[PDB]
Amino acid sequence: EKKEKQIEQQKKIQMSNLMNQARLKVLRARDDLITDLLNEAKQRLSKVVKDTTRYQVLLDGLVLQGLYQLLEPRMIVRCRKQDFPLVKAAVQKAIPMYKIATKNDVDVQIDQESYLPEDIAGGVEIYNGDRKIKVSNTLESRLDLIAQQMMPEVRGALFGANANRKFLD
Amino acid sequence: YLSQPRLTYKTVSGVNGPLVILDHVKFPRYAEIVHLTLPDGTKRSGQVLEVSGSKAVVQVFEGTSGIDAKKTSCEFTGDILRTPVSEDMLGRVFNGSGKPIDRGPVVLAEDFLDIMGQPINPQCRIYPEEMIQTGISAIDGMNSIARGQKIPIFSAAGLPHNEIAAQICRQAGLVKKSENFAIVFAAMGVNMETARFFKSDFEENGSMDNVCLFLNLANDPTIERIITPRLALTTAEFLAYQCEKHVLVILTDMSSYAEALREVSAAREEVPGRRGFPGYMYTDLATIYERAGRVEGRNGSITQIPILTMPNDDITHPIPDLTGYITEGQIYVDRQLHNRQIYPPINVLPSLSRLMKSAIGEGMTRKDHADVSNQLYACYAIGKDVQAMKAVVGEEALTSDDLLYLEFLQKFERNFIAQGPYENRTVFETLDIGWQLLRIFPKEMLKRIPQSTLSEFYPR
Amino acid sequence: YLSQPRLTYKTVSGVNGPLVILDHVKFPRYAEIVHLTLPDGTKRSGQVLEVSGSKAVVQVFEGTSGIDAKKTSCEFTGDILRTPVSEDMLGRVFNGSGKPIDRGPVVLAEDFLDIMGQPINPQCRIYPEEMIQTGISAIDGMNSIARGQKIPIFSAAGLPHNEIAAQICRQAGLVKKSENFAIVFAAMGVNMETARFFKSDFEENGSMDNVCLFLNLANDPTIERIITPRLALTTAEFLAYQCEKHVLVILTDMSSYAEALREVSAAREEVPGRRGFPGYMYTDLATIYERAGRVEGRNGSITQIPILTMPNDDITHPIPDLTGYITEGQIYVDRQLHNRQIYPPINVLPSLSRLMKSAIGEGMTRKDHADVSNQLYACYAIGKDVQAMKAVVGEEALTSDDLLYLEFLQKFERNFIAQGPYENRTVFETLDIGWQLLRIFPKEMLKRIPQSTLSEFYPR
Amino acid sequence: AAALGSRGSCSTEVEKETQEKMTILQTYFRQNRDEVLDNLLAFVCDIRPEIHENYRI
Amino acid sequence: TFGYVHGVSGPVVTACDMAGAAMYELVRVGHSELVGEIIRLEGDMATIQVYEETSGVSVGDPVLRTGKPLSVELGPGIMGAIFDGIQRPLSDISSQTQSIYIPRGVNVSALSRDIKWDFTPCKNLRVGSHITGGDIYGIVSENSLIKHKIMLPPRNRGTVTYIAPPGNYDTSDVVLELEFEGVKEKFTMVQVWPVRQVRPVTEKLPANHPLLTGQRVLDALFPCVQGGTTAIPGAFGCGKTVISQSLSKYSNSDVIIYVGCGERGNEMSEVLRDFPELTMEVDGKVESIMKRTALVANTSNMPVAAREASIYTGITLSEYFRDMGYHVSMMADSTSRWAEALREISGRLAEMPADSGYPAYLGARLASFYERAGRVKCLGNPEREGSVSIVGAVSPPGGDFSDPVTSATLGIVQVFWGLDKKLAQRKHFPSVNWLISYSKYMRALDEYYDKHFTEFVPLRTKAKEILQEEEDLAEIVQLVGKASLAETDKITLEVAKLIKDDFLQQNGYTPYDRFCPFYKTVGMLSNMIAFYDMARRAVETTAQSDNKITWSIIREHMGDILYKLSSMKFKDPLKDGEAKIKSDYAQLLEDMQNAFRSLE
Amino acid sequence: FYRLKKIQEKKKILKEKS
Ligand SMILES: Nc1ncnc2c1ncn2[C@@H]1O[C@H](COP(=O)(O)OP(=O)(O)O)[C@@H](O)[C@H]1O
């Protein structure tokens, strides 16, 4: 019976290993579902970008939201090559709104030598004078920044709440 | 929701040891988290230790090797370190910074919790009175442990403190009068075979379904050991006070954590403490040790068992000294008892448990617990003080009763203390062995036991 | 050659301690040599210890007493400290900085050699194996010395280490089983009695056309004790590895060298080691002791015999402790044997020579050398144990063998060690005395000697 | 022999209830992805410029 | 691309115009182009530690940024060689300079591009096979002992598009070419690896086999294993170097790396002289043990900053050979010199000390260096198993084991061989203490001893108990004399003295005791514990009786037997053989048994 | 003693260079 228990030990360890692998399999499946959801969100954004009437307002928001973050005398905007006629209007519109709520002057230039990769979903990037400080107001960046904070809410809305959590504080 | 875009600075102005210094930061926030992108493309994380004007002083968790001062990009988060927390974290193995290391996905968060904690009103706590029966006589019989305590294991180098820790984890339960513990386990600077030992011991006794591991091995970065005991104590607080379970937290090598503390304090050119450790090491260990106990209205608890190794077997070193001012007792693993093939080598004379008086006695364990423990302690002390001069001056100058204390010494160290690495004794077996040992002395020599108890338990 | 004119600066920025600081220097070179002329015309010399931009930190060998920041004029040499070296240096007396103090001209240099030397490729060395016969049975028979070894004398203050040194110098030669040394003597911080003793002993008990003295006395500059042994050793290396002679270097009171080194280290606030000595004292003594041996293809050698004085007769002090980690043995001069009027007062238990095993044996001295040595060591140790047991248990509680050991102790200390200050014992006489001492015991007590050696050498 | 027998059947039963759990996950996900996609895409497409509150005009 | 020198102090240079220079990157300082590493940055300036002597370096000298870290070359031509910390071959410097020194800034490749090696490919790989990092794709016959498996670098992958036929190639010919994602790599026999990055493995396994030294102690009482970690602390003259060199001569390892870090230069000439004469038997043919040894020497008067680069150079060569499937042992002589180099460099930087002067990160360096030893499943497709043991000598100042380096190491290593100066002064060698030493691999070797010797663990526990009781008796005898003693105590004392003097003691500079196999060890211990058992039983069974056989009776009766028990150690394992030694030890037992029947 | 002297040296370096 000492050897009987010596083999009972192996049965125990094998059952433990099987249960562990099953848990990890289910966790990986849930991770796959979340990743598919995020990819579909990217597709929705890319569908939005083609609506130029709404993309213009999106760009108006993004440019000013970057300018309010840098707050430098001279700034530079980097866009896509096909987005240039729209980001030009966005900058031309956002300069006075920046001079009103800050009370100082500003010189904003659109970098026409270097463009963002043409495969990105959209957005702009803002640099300071000597290009050492940078904000990245793209759609990839914004979606990745916002989606990662809503993960408790996304989990709750997608897979139901946890019936073991008695106190939320 | 922080919805504004983040700022990325290519303005590093110094690298020195574990620290990176940046200039031209816009409104630097203190304790903020920073993401560093090295020239080749690898990514590290750091935390801001000091802001002053436009400067910021980041400590990088994964070291500063490969970092230059012209092409490394530091992106500022805008928030303090909030770790993702969930109940699926049981059964998973992480590294010292919370990343999955067992071929599993990242934690899908139930919540995001600040890893510094949240102060608990001293008026909303509960006093711990439920004894934990660990199955070890030296602890159960004489240094009882209540469920909710914080009691470390003072050990040394080459001694079996991992065996004692694992046996406690394996055998711990409540005192049987008529579920069980979840386990959180942080390892700071252990070798590979200690981690192998602990994983094998957990999964060979069917526990792994209910264990969360955070592992920082001795080949891993040193500055991670600063946040490792705080991700292990933020999970234990979610499970205990929100999911309402009873958690047991093991913190292995609380000495490596303090060495990393000293290493970061020495790179900042601060006024040193004793032995070079920072002057705020007391206030730093107290924010780790004091995350344990029960709170009102919630049916969960947290028990803490840190594990030190005293340098040179010295209990007046800063680490054991300051740890003793904060925790409720200590279990002392001795080297002299180790060298004579005794397991577990627990020396009961400098061991102590400050929550024992209120967890034992009539209606909890048995009415004779405290008196037996007191008399055994007093007898052991008197026997040591005898044995000293017996070895020094005269084996025959010993009195007639100065030989009963020596026989008690031998039988107590061989029958009460020495237990066996898989033996699970009840409390009542421990008390019966204590009485079998106390029966060596005539009942007139037991002055620390009342007459009502001697009358009921001595004559058997 | 250096054909450009030298630049002279009166731009002294500040004097402090033994260090002068100069500014506006043009491309300062590290370790360069500087010639300072004081406001009253006197001349001193220094070495650059640190450069930074236009600043240079000179360390004056004679001190900074009398220097000001308006008229002291410093001239930079343009090169490191090189000493002029020749072969006429044999038969001359210089001071601790290399100038003649025997009313002769300066050295007409055969070459100019850098006094820091050059570490010898460990592949181009030859392990020393030719045994020097010093004629002292305590060294020859138990701590044998090879030609190329570095073996110091660990003495204290008031003991006769100088006469031991001079006897080794005037008696030493190879072993004759079937031409001479050139002495280089450097003394650091000696008194006039010691210099008189050595000068008188060299030119009387031998010849003085084979000695080169570098005398730095106790009323001489302290910071020039740092370059005296390096001048001595550069001369030795020229005479040995280029002119192919056998040199014997005697460096007297490395304790004064170590104390001058401590003083210069404390002057500029460097990290200390034990008892205040700089943390780089091992790496500094090793650049002096390691310039001693043989090389492949050249027929010279360098045998070093430093002389120490241990403070308070303690062998755990930093100076003897760091010296014993670098050198290939040591000869221990004892005070307890001096108080019994024993000469030479050599205690063989704390003595050692690390090159003996390869220099003794068949075809080198005699087949039985090693066994006799080991047996004498064992018997001496057991005798010294019995001598201390009898101080507690009395004269009449010893056995029949303890008295054999107490007889061996007396006859050993009086017949083997004690020698007389002009007696030259060939190594075979030493071995015969050793066997006459080992015949006190029956051949079954000699448990370190193999049987086929006892069959040939014990009965005679 | 009994161990070599049970070793496979236990594994197949665990792999059965694993697939059960995964189908439960997928039927939870199908019925909820569109509302959360609307919420996400409305959070992302709603821009509100802002200056630091510590900024002194 | 080019900075300038701005300050020099000791081994520490400070160079300006160093904007985009990374941390721990190799640079070249001066006109002699000394080698150095960057260890601090502030603005456009960088702080460099130089692995050479800085005497004569001006201000304004050039500083050349290389863009790579300190790395070693790994190919054929490593065995039988001797290097320094920078991995410069000391036998080519000695032949191209025609001098007896090492010139400052001398540049010579670590492995010769002249020798042609015999290369044969793997016979299964053809054009198209998918190969990953770690795969043995060829074998070069280096010498008669060592086969040099040629592995792919650990971070490469692809499909073979060319693999050379068998033949003779020098280490600059393309032996492999492979394509991945549309790009091509060509690989020769030599690869380059950064000495501060750990070479990857597949898995780290537990240690299950002994590392047989030649010493009776350290094999009976405190055994190491293949893949363990050991520390040998002691004062000067105790025997750390002799133990290390005997271990490197007579152990059972396939490859030996010897790092002499800041020690005597005459201790590397004793290796380069002794080892080409010692041989070992394999297939009838004898091969010298220098055909499987590599030395890395940085003596005590060599630059102090290159004591660090020495250690990392050795442990990276131990990991290159372990990856081939060998069992390597690495001797680090006086890691205390590495700690002293660290303290010196930290002092030149004006850092805050931690304990006795050492930096606060000393224990981290020590731990991450000792965490590279172990038994591993090797990266790559052919399944191998390798191992690297580390034996580190410690040199506590004053012989005090309470110094920072000894305290830091004893919390890392699993075996502790502690040497004693009291035993060294009586010439009791090896001077292990046997009362403070321990081994944490004594339970992992139970299977081996049960399956192979099966009569040894009882003997070991009995001998340990005898030696432990003797020290309780001795501190009493020291105060009350040897007269209060029972007869069993008088027997314990004499048996412990016999063990100490004729089992633990082993003069390693003799033809019979240079090496002691394990069968001889177990035989001596058997014959020494049998006498203990017999004598104790005799003194005990006739105790109350009037005959009272006591120790003096046993001693005057058997004075012919005790001499043989003491001379058991004089039996050559080579001139007598295994059978003669076993027969003599079996005959001494019968003599003992008859002599013990004689007095009853 | 050495640690406190280092702290004071750094103080009197900072205050003078700033
Ligand atoms: N096992 C041994 N057998 C014989 N002699 C030894 C032994 N161990 C040490 N010795 C002697 O003691 C001396 C110790 O020197 P070494 O081994 O270099 O110790 P350390 O490295 O601590 O200085 C050696 O010169 C050698 O002569």
Coordinates of N, CA, C and O in Angstrom, one line a residue, chain F residues 5-17:
Chain F
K5 N 30.0 62.3 5.8 CA 30.9 63.3 5.1 C 30.5 63.3 3.6 O 30.7 64.4 3.0
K6 N 30.1 62.2 3.1 CA 29.6 62.2 1.7 C 28.4 63.1 1.5 O 28.3 63.8 0.5
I7 N 27.4 62.9 2.4 CA 26.2 63.8 2.3 C 26.6 65.2 2.4 O 26.1 66.1 1.6
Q8 N 27.5 65.6 3.3 CA 27.9 67.0 3.4 C 28.6 67.5 2.2 O 28.5 68.7 1.8
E9 N 29.5 66.7 1.7 CA 30.2 67.1 0.4 C 29.3 67.3 -0.7 O 29.4 68.3 -1.5
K10 N 28.2 66.5 -0.8 CA 27.3 66.7 -1.9 C 26.5 67.9 -1.7 O 26.2 68.7 -2.6
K11 N 26.1 68.2 -0.4 CA 25.5 69.5 -0.1 C 26.3 70.7 -0.6 O 25.8 71.6 -1.3
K12 N 27.6 70.7 -0.1 CA 28.4 71.9 -0.5 C 28.9 71.8 -1.9 O 29.6 72.8 -2.3
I13 N 28.7 70.8 -2.7 CA 28.9 70.9 -4.1 C 27.7 71.5 -4.8 O 27.8 72.4 -5.6
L14 N 26.5 71.0 -4.4 CA 25.2 71.5 -5.0 C 25.1 73.0 -4.8 O 24.9 73.8 -5.7
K15 N 25.2 73.5 -3.5 CA 25.0 74.9 -3.2 C 25.9 75.8 -3.9 O 25.6 76.9 -4.2
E16 N 27.2 75.4 -4.2 CA 28.1 76.2 -4.8 C 27.9 76.2 -6.4 O 28.0 77.2 -7.0
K17 N 27.7 75.0 -6.9 CA 27.5 75.0 -8.4 C 26.1 75.5 -8.7 O 25.8 75.6 -9.9

